[PDB]
Amino acid sequence: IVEGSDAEIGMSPWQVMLFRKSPQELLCGASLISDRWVLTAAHCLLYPPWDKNFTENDLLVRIGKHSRTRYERNIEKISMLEKIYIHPRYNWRENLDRDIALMKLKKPVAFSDYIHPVCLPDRETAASLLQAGYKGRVTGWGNLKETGQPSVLQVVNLPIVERPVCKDSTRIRITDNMFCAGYKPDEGKRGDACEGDSGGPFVMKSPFNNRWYQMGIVSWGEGCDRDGKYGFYTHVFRLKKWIQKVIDQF
């Protein structure tokens, strides 16, 4: 996260760290959506152009964390993966269209003060909140600037951007499964996700029922916090039918 700040304790209790077993290192962010399902970006697990294709046994998920590098004894919980599910039409060949993946845990994680699932939006909550100028929140342990790394979880609030502005900032073909967020150059404020934040959540707090909903997944950007560029996020509601089908079938 660029131009963010330290998260408060328990501020993002759905935050999940995707962690590689060997060598031990951060791989991506992710989020807890139930006691046994974790949501992340497809590109965190699969990108054949770079020979990236992680299997379940390569990875762990670390839940309830605050510190990036410390093993947070008696606070975080580490889970193994039962199964990875990538969206079948994840477009790794072109523009990361449908950049989403689910991970089923081998065992349910115990909820706590530091471990708690986020909501997924219904159609009404999506239509009400996913509007240009409305602000969501991005969290992660990724880079502090274009690359350095944070000591603890970082947080930044960012406005959703009008779809034509998003499209006019890039040569990449933007689909309805993506939205973009970030400040414009003339707005003065700054902030962005960056390398290492991939797969983490973009959330919004409903003003109707005071619950947090995950509207986006950190997907890609051209650089980090560059003027005239914006962060792009997977449109979670647009793919929720796939999410429901996976969890219902499995």
């Binding site: 408060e8 304790i9 929140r137 609030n157 707090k205 003003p207």
Partner: peptide
Amino acid sequence: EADCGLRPLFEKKSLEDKTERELLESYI
């Protein structure tokens, strides 16, 4: 979960975090 999106250390105990007001003020 029926308890989704309510944080044990904030909504559950009616405490606000330091910047959630910024989100609410944008929903206008």
